[PDB]
Design an enzyme around this catalytic site. Structure first.
Site: not given
Ligand SMILES: CC[C@H]1OC(=O)[C@H](C)[C@@H](O[C@H]2C[C@@](C)(OC)[C@@H](O)[C@H](C)O2)[C@H](C)[C@@H](O[C@@H]2O[C@H](C)C[C@H](N(C)C)[C@H]2O)[C@](C)(O)C[C@@H](C)CN(C)[C@H](C)[C@@H](O)[C@]1(C)O
Ligand SMILES: [Ca+2]
Ligand SMILES: Nc1nc2c(ncn2[C@@H]2O[C@H](COP(=O)(O)OP(=O)(O)O)[C@@H](O)[C@H]2O)c(=O)[nH]1
Ligand SMILES: [Mg+2]
Length: 298
Positions: A199
């Site tokens: 993560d």
């Molecule tokens: C770079 C631009 C964006 O940022 C990313 O993409 C991040 C790296 C992304 O993370 C990326 C990369 C990766 C590897 O997580 C680091 C992947 O697992 C997720 C799905 O997307 C985050 C950390 C995800 O949050 C993670 O969602 C997982 C399903 C669970 C995880 N944790 C709780 C275990 C949690 O941190 C999430 C679901 O995107 C968070 C959610 C609340 C809000 N998003 C929708 C926003 C708007 C994002 O799109 C962004 C800010 O615009």
């Molecule tokens: Ca966690």
């Protein structure tokens, strides 16, 4: 006020004596409430107040990962749970600040660095940190309950997780053939696995004033698998330039590298909807359900 008093008393029962005026609450999650407080020596602590039963079984994996990192790693800090009971988990706050935090609005980042001029030290330091992490000898552990994959098993895992998501949620048509094409491309897939954080993103990467990564928090997703997951954030946040910068630093300090590494990470990035769908299931949070459905391209 009663919340504050309860924090003081729980901490006190674990010989942690806090300055009451410094106690700050984050919004609780399903699992615990995160609390910040400074002790009677001026030291900042992080507390997790449990909100569910079975604390030890549910934290076993995170704690095994933390034990590995605290035993083996020198280039970064990780939480050291000096207090670890069913009633309280607490550790001394890591140095630095999160490089960025997910806000409480759309969910975009509030950045501590300039997204349009990312310091190159961020990529150099993270590359060193990840190369160290991913080479930790998790096998020397007498007990290991982390998920552990060989390279072949990591590929089969992605295949299965994808089939699973396409059957609870369904999956857009064109997205599937991209996924399946990736799975079936032998030369793309790594021939080594390692201990990952799982993560890695700006909210979990602690940085100093020069944007060196000095610490990593929240190790609940740790496992031994494809190292590629820990590069995804760099690609999403910083594009191809930040992905290449991270790969370069990692490779040049000895991290495992293969010719199609960049291309493979980019395909893994396209599989990001798998992880959102899975989180929707385990958490039951309606917002992630809709988020999953849009990301899956129904
Ligand atoms: C770079 C631009 C964006 O940022 C990313 O993409 C991040 C790296 C992304 O993370 C990326 C990369 C990766 C590897 O997580 C680091 C992947 O697992 C997720 C799905 O997307 C985050 C950390 C995800 O949050 C993670 O969602 C997982 C399903 C669970 C995880 N944790 C709780 C275990 C949690 O941190 C999430 C679901 O995107 C968070 C959610 C609340 C809000 N998003 C929708 C926003 C708007 C994002 O799109 C962004 C800010 O615009
Ligand atoms: Ca966690
Ligand atoms: N700055 C800082 N924040 C921390 C630290 N530990 C936890 N946090 C904060 O507490 C939040 C929640 O802690 P985390 O370990 O990620 O648990 P989560 O609620 O399950 O995501 C994080 O997003 C951080 O903002 C730390 O050592 N330093
Ligand atoms: Mg977290």
């Amino acid at each position: 006020s009663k919340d504050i008093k309860q924090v003081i008393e729980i901490a006190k029962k674990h010989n942690l004596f806090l300055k009451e005026e410094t106690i700050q609450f984050n919004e609780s999650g399903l699992d615990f409430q995160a609390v910040f407080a400074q002790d009677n020596n001026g030291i900042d602590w992080v507390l997790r107040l449990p909100r569910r039963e079975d604390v030890m079984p549910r934290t076993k994996v995170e704690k095994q990962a933390l034990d590995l990192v605290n035993k083996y790693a020198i280039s970064f800090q990780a939480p050291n749970w000096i207090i670890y009971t069913e009633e309280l988990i607490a550790y001394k706050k890591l140095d630095g600040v999160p490089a960025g935090t997910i806000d409480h609005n759309i969910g975009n980042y509030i950045w501590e660095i300039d997204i349009n001029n990312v310091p190159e030290l961020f990529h150099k330091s993270l590359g060193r940190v990840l190369a160290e992490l991913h080479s930790i000898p998790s096998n020397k552990a007498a007990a290991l309950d982390l998920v552990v994959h060989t390279p072949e098993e990591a590929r089969m895992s992605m295949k299965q997780r994808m089939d699973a998501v396409r059957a609870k949620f369904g999956v857009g048509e064109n997205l599937w053939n991209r996924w399946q094409a990736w799975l079936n491309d032998d030369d793309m897939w790594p021939k080594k696995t390692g201990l990952i954080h799982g993560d890695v993103h700006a909210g979990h990467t602690m940085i100093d004033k020069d944007a060196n990564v000095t610490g990593l928090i929240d190790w609940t997703e740790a496992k031994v698998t494809d190292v590629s997951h820990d590069f995804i954030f760099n690609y999403r946040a910083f594009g191809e330039e930040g992905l290449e910068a991270l790969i370069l630093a990692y490779k040049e300090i000895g991290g495992y590298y293969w010719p199609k590494m960049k291309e493979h990470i980019i395909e893994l990035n396209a599989a990001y909807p798998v992880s959102i769908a899975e989180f929707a299931l385990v958490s039951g949070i309606e917002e992630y359900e809709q988020m999953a459905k849009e990301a899956l391209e129904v």
